[PDB]
Amino acid sequence: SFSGYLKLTDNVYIKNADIVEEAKKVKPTVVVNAANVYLKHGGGVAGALNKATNNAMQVESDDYIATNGPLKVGGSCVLSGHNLAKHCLHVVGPNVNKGEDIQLLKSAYENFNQHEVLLAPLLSAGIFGADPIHSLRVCVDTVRTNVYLAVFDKNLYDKLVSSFL
Ligand SMILES: NC(=O)c1cnc(C(F)(F)F)nc1
Numbered sequence: 001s002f003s004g005y006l007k008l009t010d011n012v013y014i015k016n017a018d019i020v021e022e023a024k025k026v027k028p029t030v031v032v033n034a035a036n037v038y039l040k041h042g043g044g045v046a047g048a049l050n051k052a053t054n055n056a057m058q059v060e061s062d063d064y065i066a067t068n069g070p071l072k073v074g075g076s077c078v079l080s081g082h083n084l085a086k087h088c089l090h091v092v093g094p095n096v097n098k099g100e101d102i103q104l105l106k107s108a109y110e111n112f113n114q115h116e117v118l119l120a121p122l123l124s125a126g127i128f129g130a131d132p133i134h135s136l137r138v139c140v141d142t143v144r145t146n147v148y149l150a151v152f153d154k155n156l157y158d159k160l161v162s163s164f165l
Contacts, residue, residue, distance in 0.1 A: 002026060002148045004117070008164055012140050012147050016157035019045060019121050019150040020052045023084035028148075031085035032112070032120035032129065033057075035092050037070040039077075044127040045152075053082035061090070073100050074107030089115060093123030096130050105135060109142035116145040122160075126152075136160055 005013035010053040017024070023031045033047040039061035041050035050057040060079055071077055076091040091110040096102035108123050122139065124130035132151075139147065 002028075003141075005148055006161060008136075008161075009140050011144060012149065014136075014149045014151060014157070014160065016152075016154050017150040018048075018152055019119065020048050020084070022121055022148075022150045023049070024052070026119060027085060028081075028117065028119040029086045030089050030118040030147050031081050031087075032118050032123075033088050033090045034121050034123060034126070035071070035076075035090035036095065037073060037075075037092055039065055039071070039090060041126045045121045049084060049088070052084060055086065056080075056082050074104040076108075076111035078122045085119065089118065091123060093128055093135075094130070096124065097128065102130060102134075103136045105130065110138055112139075112143045112147055113145050114143055119147070119148050119150060121150060121152075125156075132156055132160060133163055136164065 005015045033049050041058050071092050073092050073094050079088050081088045091108050091111050094104040105124050122132050122135040125132040125135045
């Protein structure tokens with residue numbers, strides 16, 4: 001199972017780790033992708049997860065979008081986890097660099113409650129532009145299921161742990 005995580009709350013754990021390397025090691029039931037509405041996995045966590053699947057995630061995602069259309073900001077879909085996990089839960093947090101409503105971050109985290117355990121990044125953090133301290137706060141106050149957060153950046157991980165209320 002998950003190792004080396006710091007326990008933040010009854011159900012939220014955190015580790016300074018590359019979510020791709022973490023997924024390859026744990027092979028969790030669910031890995032969360034920091035997706036956009038088009039499932040265009042170009043950069044950030046999405047680009048990294050997709051590259052690890054040798055682009056199979058993007059091929060599957062394009063077929064999903066061709067059939068279903070785009071996701072909503074705050075929404076999700078369950079697709080294959082490929083070589084990384086049983087499933088990938090593609091969750092769209094608001095991208096504040098695209099002027100999206102930060103209030104939708106709670107709706108985005110609510111998707112995690114449909115899965116008993118997940119390996120996840122902080123939603124809307126990184127290239128999505130939100131404050132990761134705020135994202136962790138919304139995560140702990142919204143997610144009730146077991147969430148193992150992988151924070152790529154060591155300096156950000158230390159700031160998140162040291163400032164956690
Ligand atoms: N394995 C990678 O190449 C990798 C790159 N970038 C990231 C990011 F975006 F979370 F920081 N995580 C992993």
